[PDB]
Write a protein that binds this ligand. Structure first.
Ligand SMILES: *C(=O)[C@@H](C)NC(=O)c1ccccc1
Ligand SMILES: [Cl-]
Ligand SMILES: [Cl-]
Lengths: 468, 469
């Protein structure tokens, strides 16, 4: 007689007990953590690896008591998501075995989880790849941990230049991206669309050199990272996250920089009217509104450029109308292709997606670029068939507090006079608008104008520029 | 008493696009027959009064005689194609007005035309964009007139290097691609996938420099080009073609270099069963089998690299199995975006496609990249549902006659001893197999290893080669 229900109150199951489906265990486990804090607090503790007596009590309270447990799960969307993974799951198998999958669909204004995919098939495997397994987010780390923070601290703007010239780790090893040692200077947009690694590495070093509390940012979105003094951290080195938590970081970018904590339980009510737990809205401005809406604009291009994912193309062919909603996203690829991530938002929703194997062995080279992008387009279509207005028709837009600068294409700073080789120069050339999240906008071009680069790099780029 | 039929004898009509197109070709064939019958001949044929008299006689024969006309059209494929453009034609519209379209499906072993799309909707607009419209094929011309010819003449192979360093036309204007003046050296594979312009320009110039008979190659495919002395010829300048004729040129690459002449008419038969006209197969080896099969491997990557078309992604979402056929293809885009082209083949079929506006105004930037790719993936899929074996599952494959070479990745040539600004150098580094269509494969590396390039260009490039040993 204790009960778990969908957001509209329809029963999911009753809870009982015995001695010897993803939806059931996920929602029960979150309901038990809610019951525990409630119990711990009503007996005024804060003491203790028992504990652990409170876990057991919370399970008993729910399996004996008569409690109504309201979830955020939308029955139609969640069922459509199961049918999707059942009908199009095979799209992910790439010749490397049975490829597993995790997907969380989150509401950007509230943090509520509308539906999810726990895996390919509960009966054949029960690991919950939406809420339990933790893998490096790799590249999908770079907007949250490196570029979004640098934009937020007034250290760069949308058309800032970064170095992708070859450079080494402190140990001598060259920093790589697939087989490439590096190219030269590029925009942010290019560093993002292609997902290069050297530009994120220099951004994070800048942040450290300037004393940015990067930990403060990540903690406010609930990320737990044990060691920040890692050179590859912007590449996802030393980080490991569930699909649900990571979706929650993209929710933050999509919601104009304002976090709401992910949840699957909204209310726990006793048969006697005692409300044991109700979700409190607790919004947190993590990035300014200028930062987040600037970041949205870049992530729009990461998908429309198709450089690292075929998603827009796949979705165009399945549902050209849905494909013209305002989609933004980032992909991620682990160093041996062990894990592929694709994160998508419209202004209303965020959908996180991971694929990999349980034993961590390698996927094919294109599992992320192609298989996962195509499977996710199917899943996005399904959610839509079930709830045709849930993705929303609104567009992401720059906040009015965003600051505009006219800069040069070649330096991403204002045109101006710099001294090169001792001998002076007047720099000019084709220009562009770059967006900033400070008061003053972009600076005037100085000698070292980009994020990173050795002296030899700057001498090579400066030279080619004065090729005017 | 006169009738037109599908290839299976089923009756088309008594003698919409389908009707006029096939009537018109039959009339063409009848004219030819009347003219030879009355032994008219030659300069007399150029007179327009007599031209008029014979057209009028051809037409009247067809309504008067009781001629049985059998066409190459597969009824089921053709209607699927008609349904497809009715259902999916809207995918092409892009905010530049209503976009027209032409498609021709051709059997690669016979040159027969199985079906076609004349336009968005005959009742609204009656111009036939498969058979009558002529527009520059743009990029789409590079594989045929630049790179395929050069490979066939022994002047390059699959990983030959070509210059895409900025350069100017003879009048001093720079050769552009989008808004880029160009980059540096690059392989043929990358020149083809991204569709750069400067490499095609140097290839053609080289063929002029070796006196290659390019006109001879184009004429064997039935191409009519009034003037070959044009610097932008291999980009498609000074060429305008119908969809049907251009399909025929990609038919030739697809059929291992051997052309068959396009046609929707296979036979016309007099009331009493004698043959006024019947199609006579005349295959011509236009490219060596080594050339065309090397081209096939290159055009495979144009599609699967997805740089200029999203086609393989679209097809993959509509039909994962059909996407695993062995597709090869090339896109093209006019200056200013007035015409887009996507040409596709499996070993059995070629499908040509054009989109654009009847008064030539610009399409949007992505109209070829995304729209026409998506629309063509739907058309391809409708063909499959209507005739499930038709595309086939065979693979293109290098002909035994192809020579392989191990060349330096960075020169496109055999590793070796090279003289650089005085000091001789030993040139080494990673290698790769390059395919050639001559007797001896690839030569040894020499100072001008690439197609095209200035001295300043070469002093840049060697800088890198050397600084990397
Ligand atoms: C981050 O992990 C980087 C290296 N890039 C990608 O997300 C990616 C994904 C798929 C194909 C190419 C690159
Ligand atoms: Cl492919
Ligand atoms: Cl694509």
């Amino acid at each position: 007689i204790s009960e778990i229900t969908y957001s509209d109150g329809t029963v999911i199951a009753s809870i009982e007990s015995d001695m010897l489906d993803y939806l059931y265990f996920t929602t029960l486990a979150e309901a038990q953590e809610r019951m525990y804090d409630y119990l711990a607090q009503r007996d005024n503790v804060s003491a203790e690896a028992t504990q652990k007596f409170y876990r057991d009590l919370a399970a008993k309270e729910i399996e004996n008591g008569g409690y109504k447990i309201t979830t955020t799960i939308d029955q139609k969307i969640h069922s459509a998501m199961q049918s999707a993974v059942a009908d199009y799951g095979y799209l992910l198998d790439d010749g490397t075995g049975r490829v597993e999958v995790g997907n969380v669909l989150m509401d950007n204004q509230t943090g509520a989880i509308l539906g999810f995919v726990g895996g390919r098939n509960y009966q054949e495997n029960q690991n919950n790849h939406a809420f339990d397994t933790k893998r490096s987010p790799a590249s999908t780390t770079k907007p949250l941990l490196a570029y979004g923070i640098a934009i937020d601290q007034g250290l760069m703007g949308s058309e800032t230049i970064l170095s992708n010239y070859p450079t080494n780790f402190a140990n001598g090893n060259p920093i790589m991206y697939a087989n490439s040692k590096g190219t030269g200077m590029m925009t942010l947009g290019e560093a993002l669309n292609y997902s290069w690694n050297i530009p994120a590495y220099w951004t994070y070093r800048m942040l450290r050199e300037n004393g940015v509390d990067v930990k403060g940012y990540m903690e406010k979105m609930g990320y737990e990272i044990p060691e920040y003094g890692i050179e590859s951290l912007p590449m996802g080195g030393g980080i490991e996250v569930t699909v649900a938590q990571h979706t929650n970081g993209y929710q933050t970018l999509a919601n104009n920089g304002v976090y709401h904590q992910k949840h699957v339980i909204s209310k726990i009510e006793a048969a006697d009217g005692r409300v044991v737990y109700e979700y409190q809205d607790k919004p947190v401005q993590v990035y300014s509104k200028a930062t987040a809406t600037i970041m949205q604009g870049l992530l729009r291009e990461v998908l429309s450029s198709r450089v690292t994912t075929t998603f827009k193309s796949n979705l165009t062919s399945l549902n050209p109308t849905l494909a013209n909603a305002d989609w933004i996203g980032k992909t991620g690829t682990t160093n041996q292709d062990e894990n592929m991530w694709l994160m998508l938002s419209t202004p209303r929703l965020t959908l996180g997606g991971w694929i990999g194997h349980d034993d961590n062995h390698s996927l094919s080279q294109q599992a992320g670029y192609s298989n996962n992008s195509n499977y996710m387009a199917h899943l996005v279509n399904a959610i839509q068939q079930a709830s045709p207005s849930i993705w929303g028709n609104e567009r992401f837009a720059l906040d009015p507090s965003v600051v505009k600068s006219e800069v040069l294409k070649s330096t991403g700073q204002k045109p101006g006079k710099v001294s090169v080789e001792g001998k002076e120069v007047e720099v000019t050339g084709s220009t562009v608008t770059s967006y900033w999240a400070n008061k003053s906008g972009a600076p005037a071009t100085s000698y070292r104008f980009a994020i990173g680069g050795s002296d030899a790099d700057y001498q090579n780029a400066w030279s080619s520029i004065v090729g005017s």
